Design a protein around this ligand. Sequence first.
Ligand SMILES: NC(=O)c1ccc(Nc2nc(N)c(C(=O)c3cccnc3)s2)cc1
Length: 294
Amino acid sequence: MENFQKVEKIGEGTYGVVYKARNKLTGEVVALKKIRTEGVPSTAIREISLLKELNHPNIVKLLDVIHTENKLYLVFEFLHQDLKKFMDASALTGIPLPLIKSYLFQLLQGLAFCHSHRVLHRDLKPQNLLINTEGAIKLADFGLARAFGVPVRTYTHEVVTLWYRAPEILLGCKYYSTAVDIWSLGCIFAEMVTRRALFPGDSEIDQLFRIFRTLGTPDEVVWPGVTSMPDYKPSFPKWARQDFSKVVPPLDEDGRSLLSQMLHYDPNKRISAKAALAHPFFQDVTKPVPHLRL
Ligand SMILES: NC(=O)c1ccc(Nc2nc(N)c(C(=O)c3cccnc3)s2)cc1
């Protein structure tokens, strides 16, 4: 990269490779994401160019967009660690509840902001959540399937994670609502608490059935319209819903209650980010600083 200096490769997202780089001129350290190849749509670059204005303390700042040679480069502010790494590093002891609560609260603030601006993330996962030494956590990547789509892998043979995908997506809904982000965040919340992914599916059907085995196979009573969904099959096994206290022990009732609302099957009953911020679980929220080893 003529203007930069790919310090190190720090990821390989579902579109391209992310590098840590220094602006040889400004000297600023940034995350540079290279995107795939035969001209690159102008509709996306306009969708992207729209993200530059989406600034919030809990959203990774998109600094520059550069189109050149069937290659699209996205320049983002750099953060030192992602939540996946932090969770793995905290696996022995667990992330303290107050920090879990702070991170959840901040991510809901970030989502309330995006959603009020009619922007959906669509692919929330621990690897797309970045943290710093000051205790902030920010939303990164944003997918962009409305300006690109769901990739078969990433760009070069890679197993896309389905663990955080909302059921309406798995059932073939063609129009996603902001509810898909609340579902993913609920899955991440559970994972921070238990130190185990909630629904670790290894295929779309296994992902769906893992959800059904835990929350019960949905029906018209809890999810009006579900049996008419594109990929719904009357032949799906009928599993009973599991007691919620068994899913995220030892989370307190306030936490369970909020998680249950973030995981409602019906996208329309699923709690909004705005409403979640008002939940009693956050009455005593604070902003602890994490112990980060960089
Ligand atoms: N695992 C690591 O050591 C690690 C180190 C530093 C990072 N730091 C990152 N900073 C930004 N801004 C990132 C992104 O904007 C991003 C994230 C995910 C997909 N696409 C773009 S990744 C992330 C991970």
